[PDB]
């Protein structure tokens, strides 16, 4: 939902008040991606 997938583009294109919203969107998405990856890895490592 952010304007760009690249963090540096948002940082170089927006003022801090709106860069905060866009970076918050990206942080939410990427942190959920790591949460998913770590959970799958824990289950797979239990199997291994």
């Amino acid at each position: 939902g952010a304007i760009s997938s690249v963090l540096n583009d948002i940082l170089s294109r927006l003022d801090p008040p709106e860069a905060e919203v866009q970076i918050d969107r990206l942080i939410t998405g990427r942190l959920q991606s790591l949460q998913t990856y770590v959970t799958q890895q824990l289950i797979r490592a239990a199997e291994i």
Partner: protein, 48 residues
């Protein structure tokens, strides 16, 4: 585009394609000649 003698009616809004040049937006942003200067998806200071 800014200082043209006449502007077209909105139903036949004029379009000018600016390309192959160097744009100095500072003179646009520091001028007090505009009542509404709202950049969307980008920041006015970052334009340079």
């Amino acid at each position: 585009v800014f200082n043209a003698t006449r502007f077209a009616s909105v139903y036949a809004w004029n379009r000018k394609r600016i390309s192959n040049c160097v744009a100095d937006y500072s003179v646009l942003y520091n001028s007090a000649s505009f009542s509404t200067f709202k950049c969307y998806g980008v920041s006015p200071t970052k334009l340079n």
